[PDB]
């Protein structure tokens, strides 16, 4: 069961100075159109065949939506399931500068999905600790060129995911920080983030940040057995696909693009399999990194939420068209 959202960030000053116009438009609460701008010395077109193309999503947002509104429309509903033992996943997807980190982390003035979700999580827990015992743990790490960082413990840089007795993949050694408040979770991500590989030339356009929250629930009634539940929420902020011909990436850079492109392909192969057929033959989780971690999650009785991001800027038309196509339902 998959949900796909598209977020349009407001246009930027840098874009206006480059001379960009608005070509992306929320038309509808779940429809976005993308105007084609134009540029000679062609076109042999007009003969347009658009001009304008439409795109539909489970939900859509532009600058009118607040942080809280995107939270409420994307991930709030996941919470009930997670504390009940079900698994869930939220991706921020899109090109660099289109909004991923803002949607997921937010700012002090404007908090994103991480904290709004952690918040309703702890309230949901209290509202039901009459009946239930709960344990909550969260971690915040980085995957950069298939190499982990933990974001906390400084001594590991190559963690390999291992299977338990029931074939469930899970990162081995991955630190696990106990968090008793929202102010602590934010500090952990801010203190650990600095570790996230940045642009050798700013964060690296190749850095996944994974926030994972684990929740164990058992009954307070002891004279009746009942299953002990364990839900796992993954909240992920990634980078963008790189056309290596452009950029002209070499060595550390050249190889860097090969990975990101590989991981995004793998991910695309996994979500495509989950969306369609069908036993299956087994959904290709074994494709690559970021997948080893998400293996036991993302399956039959688990939820996925993808939030695609674009610029509304004319100067971004090609990227936006790729994004809209990819996420387009």
UniProtKB/Swiss-Prot annotation:
Residues 1-329 form the Kinesin motor domain. Disruption phenotype: Mice show growth retardation, higher mortality (4 weeks after birth) and display hydrocephalus as well as female infertility. Female infertility is probably caused by fallopian tube obstruction. Phenotypes are due to abnormally elongated cilia that cannot generate proper fluid flow. ATP binds at residues 94-101. It comes from the Eukaryota. Strongly expressed in the oviduct and trachea. Expressed in testis, lung, ovary and brain. It is found in: Cytoplasm, Cytoskeleton; Cell projection, Cilium. Plus end-directed microtubule-dependent motor protein that regulates the length of motile cilia by mediating depolymerization of microtubules at ciliary tips. Belongs to the TRAFAC class myosin-kinesin ATPase superfamily. Kinesin family. This is Kinesin-like protein KIF19.
């Amino acid at each position: 069961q998959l949900m796909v959202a598209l977020r349009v960030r407001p246009i930027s000053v840098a874009e206006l100075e480059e001379g960009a116009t608005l070509i992306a438009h929320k038309m509808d609460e779940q429809m976005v159109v993308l105007m084609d701008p134009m540029e000679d010395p062609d076109d042999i077109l007009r003969a347009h065949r658009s001009r304008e193309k439409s795109y539909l999503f489970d939900v859509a947002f532009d600058f009118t939506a607040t942080q809280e509104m995107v939270y409420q429309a994307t991930t709030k509903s996941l919470i009930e399931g997670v504390i009940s033992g079900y698994n869930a996943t939220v991706f921020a997807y899109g090109p660099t500068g289109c909004g991923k980190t803002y949607t997921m982390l937010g700012t002090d003035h404007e908090p994103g999905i991480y904290v709004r979700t952690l918040n309703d999580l702890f309230r949901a827990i209290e509202e039901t600790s009459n009946d239930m015992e709960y344990e909550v743990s969260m971690s915040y790490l980085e995957i950069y060129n298939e190499m982990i960082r933990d974001l906390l413990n400084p001594a590991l840089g190559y963690l390999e995911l291992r299977e338990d007795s029931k074939g469930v993949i899970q990162v081995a050694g991955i630190t696990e920080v106990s968090t008793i408040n929202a102010k602590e979770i934010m500090q952990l991500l801010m203190k650990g983030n600095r570790q996230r590989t940045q642009e050798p030339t700013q964060t690296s356009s190749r850095s996944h940040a994974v926030l994972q929250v684990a929740v164990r629930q058992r009954s307070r009634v002891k004279n009746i057995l009942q299953e002990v539940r364990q839900g796992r929420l993954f909240m992920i902020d990634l980078a963008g696909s790189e056309r290596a011909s452009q950029t002209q990436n070499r060595g550390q850079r050249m190889k860097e693009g090969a990975h990101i492109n590989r991981s995004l392909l793998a991910l695309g192969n996994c979500i495509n399999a989950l969306s369609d057929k069908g036993s299956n033959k087994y959904i290709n989780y074994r494709d690559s990194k970021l997948t080893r971690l998400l293996k036991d999650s993302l399956g039959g009785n688990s939820r996925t939420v993808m939030i695609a991001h674009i610029s509304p800027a004319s100067t971004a038309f090609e990227e936006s068209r790729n994004t809209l196509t990819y996420a387009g339902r």
